[PDB]
């Protein structure tokens, strides 16, 4: 749980810093596949699974 | 660093369907349709 909290805070920091990253991860598009693809691409191996 | 590549990749990736988000008295706003 502590690791989950820390990693969620880390991704919050990343989203705040990368405004463009936050804006595309936040677009209201119905298609989720592209978004998730950007996600893992930029963060999949750096954070736990949960 | 990897953000630029990662973000760029996204733009690149783009029978495609958009959705109306606003509508009124003749003007309608459609989210999506990246290739319109």
Swiss-Prot record, chain A:
Which cell locations does it reside in?
Cell membrane
Coiled-coil regions, chain positions? none
Tell me the superkingdom of the source.
Bacteria
Signal sequence annotation: none
Q: What does this protein do?
A: F(1)F(0) ATP synthase produces ATP from ADP in the presence of a proton or sodium gradient. F-type ATPases consist of two structural domains, F(1) containing the extramembraneous catalytic core and F(0) containing the membrane proton channel, linked together by a central stalk and a peripheral stalk. During catalysis, ATP synthesis in the catalytic domain of F(1) is coupled via a rotary mechanism of the central stalk subunits to proton translocation. This fusion protein includes a component of the F(0) channel (subunit b) and of the F(1) subunit (subunit delta). Two copies of subunit b and one of delta together form the peripheral 'stator' stalk which links F(1) to F(0).
Could you share any additional remarks the record makes about this protein?
Binds 2-aminothiazole antibiotics, which are antitubercular agents.
Which proteins does it associate with, and in what oligomeric form?
F-type ATPases have 2 components, F(1) - the catalytic core - and F(0) - the membrane proton channel. F(1) has five subunits: alpha(3), beta(3), gamma(1), delta(1), epsilon(1). F(0) has three main subunits: a(1), b(2) and c(10-14). The alpha and beta chains form an alternating ring which encloses part of the gamma chain. F(1) is attached to F(0) by a central stalk formed by the gamma and epsilon chains, while a peripheral stalk is formed by the delta and b chains.
Q: Which family does it belong to?
A: In the N-terminal section; belongs to the ATPase B chain family.
* Protein name per the record: ATP synthase subunit b-delta
Gene this protein is translated from: atpFH
Curated annotation (Swiss-Prot), chain B:
Tell me where it resides.
Cell membrane
Highest taxon listed in the record's lineage: Bacteria
Instruction: State how it assembles.
Output: F-type ATPases have 2 components, CF(1) - the catalytic core - and CF(0) - the membrane proton channel. CF(1) has five subunits: alpha(3), beta(3), gamma(1), delta(1), epsilon(1). CF(0) has three main subunits: a(1), b(2) and c(9-12). The alpha and beta chains form an alternating ring which encloses part of the gamma chain. CF(1) is attached to CF(0) by a central stalk formed by the gamma and epsilon chains, while a peripheral stalk is formed by the delta and b chains.
Q: What does this protein do?
A: Produces ATP from ADP in the presence of a proton gradient across the membrane. The alpha chain is a regulatory subunit.
Please report which protein family the annotation says this sequence is part of.
Belongs to the ATPase alpha/beta chains family.
Name listed for the protein in its UniProt record: ATP synthase subunit alpha
Origin organism is Mycolicibacterium smegmatis (strain ATCC 700084 / mc(2)155) (Mycobacterium smegmatis)
